Structure 1
Amino acid sequence: TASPADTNVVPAKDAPTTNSPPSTTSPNQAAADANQQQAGIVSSQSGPNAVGDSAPSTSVNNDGDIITRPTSDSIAAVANATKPAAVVSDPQSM
């Protein structure tokens, strides 16, 4: 009778962007389409509402850039690109 599943419905974790497919071309439109198809709506019934919409995607950075890996790794990548040797061997060292 008093089914909790019908009373305690709340958005799941990572809800706003979970369905976003991994792509770089048009992530927001692609994510929007994925949400629409995931929700069970078919394009033939949504009509004109499906053409211009866009939704948040994981491929888009908070700054508004196309990202292909977690931002920490991007930070790690640039950091690792610059690591001069701590101790070097040269004849004139005192």
Structure 2
Amino acid sequence: SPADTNVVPAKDAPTTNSPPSTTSPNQAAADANQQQAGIVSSQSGPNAVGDSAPSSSVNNDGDIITRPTSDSIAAVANATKPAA
């Protein structure tokens, strides 16, 4: 029974479920993933307490991004263009 014999991490899996948050990026994501898996809260006790998941917002550096790393470089760049 194929399409089962071979299952690999989905496209961009690290941070798929990760919800667009500005409060606790990781916690918020370690939860979308939590409910996502279907694992009820009351079921996993101590575990689902202090935990993080890669977040779709957190970006590669600590900083809690609010838009693509690229469109952010684009902001700084644009805001600096003396009249040719």
Counterpart of 2:18?
A: 20
Asked which structure has the greater CA Rg, the reply is 1
1:37 corresponds to which residue? 35
> In 2, distance between residues paired with 1:63 and 1:45?
33
Identity %: 99
After TM superposition, give the deviation of residue 85 of structure 1 in Å. Answer: 1.2
Any unmatched runs of 5+ in structure 2? none
Instruction: Give how far 1:49 is off.
Output: 1.0
- TM-score after normalising by structure 1: 0.85
Task: Report the secondary structure of 2:3's partner residue.
Answer: helix
Runs of at least 4 residues off by over 3 Å = none
Q: Provide the aligned C-alpha RMSD in A.
A: 0.8
* Alpha-carbon offset, residue 30 of structure 1: 0.6
Q: Post-superposition shift, 1:18?
A: 0.3
Q: CA deviation at 1:47?
A: 1.4
Distance 1:66 1:6 in 2: 36
Structure with the larger helix share? 1
Q: Which stretches in structure 1 are left out of the alignment for 5+ residues? A: 87-94
Tell me the alpha carbon deviations over residues 41-62 of structure 1, each in whole angstroms, 9 at most, x when there is no partner.
1011111211111111011020
Cα deviation for residue 6 of structure 1 reads 1.7
SS at match of 2:43: helix
Query: Following the alignment from structure 2 to structure 1, what is the Cα–Cα distance between the partners of residues 45 and 79?
Result: 50
Decide which of 66, 76, 79 is 1:78's aligned counterpart.
76
3-state SS in 2 of match to 1:16: helix
Deviation by residue 1:2-33 (Cα, 9 ceiling, x = unmatched): x1122011111111110100011101001001
* Separation of aligned partners in 1, 2:4 and 2:77: 49
